[PDB]
Design a protein around this ligand. Sequence first.
Ligand SMILES: O[C@H]1CN[C@H]2Cc3c([nH]c4ccccc34)[C@@H]1C2
Length: 282
Amino acid sequence: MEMEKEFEQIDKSGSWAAIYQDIRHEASDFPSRVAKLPKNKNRNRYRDVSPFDHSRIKLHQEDNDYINASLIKMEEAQRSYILTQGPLPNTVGHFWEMVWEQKSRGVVMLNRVMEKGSLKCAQYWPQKEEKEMIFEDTNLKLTLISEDIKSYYTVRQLELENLTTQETREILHFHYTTWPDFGVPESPASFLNFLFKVRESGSLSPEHGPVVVHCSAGIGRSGTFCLADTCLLLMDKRKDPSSVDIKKVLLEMRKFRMGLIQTADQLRFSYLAVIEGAKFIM
Ligand SMILES: O[C@H]1CN[C@H]2Cc3c([nH]c4ccccc34)[C@@H]1C2
């Protein structure tokens, strides 16, 4: 079926939970043996969210190459994404090592450091120009260059220096700051505006390594971001845009990381975002 009318048909019939449970039943199950090794327990935020072995990002280290991060490679859309958990106190150096080694231009953050009164990720970037951060375990230096605070999101320019080679690179930090502590946004308008700002920066384009996107577990809000982006790109590329099937795209993405889209409300919000987004593109 088309999307906008499939949408109203699920609303009128109130069957979002049944649709979402079908997706959960059909989703791929691949091994995640490296994630579950005992030496990696303090590298995982949640015991039930792990990268598959076949698609995990490897650190360029011979001691321990493990990080909780996955490469989502979308062949028809010609887009790639790295989805990862919010960094832990003992993985902030690994996080920036990954950004460096994978040649990423942009980092997309969809959570606040504290939500619901608890810490959802480490404070992993510097908050003042004159107070830079050094990650001694991976030999990197990170400096805040500029910050632009808007009503729904903040954009930061960062300098990452590899202290071993003295090479430097400019990284863009795109921080969506207004996702509610509970539920999903009422309108997709600010989330779509944010997606378009990331696109306009070049961070999603083939001349760079894959964008790094995270929330707390790296599957819910993060899944919503890449699902909406890929569906909108396919609607622009195909002769028949009504042929794009958001449930089929989501199941394709779940071949590369488990659990993408965590609730039936996030599934409905993803439909809404693609529907409204397709009208603005034209
Ligand atoms: O109620 C329907 C209206 N038309 C479509 C778009 C749309 C819907 N709900 C929304 C809420 C906020 C923004 C846009 C929408 C449903 C489907």
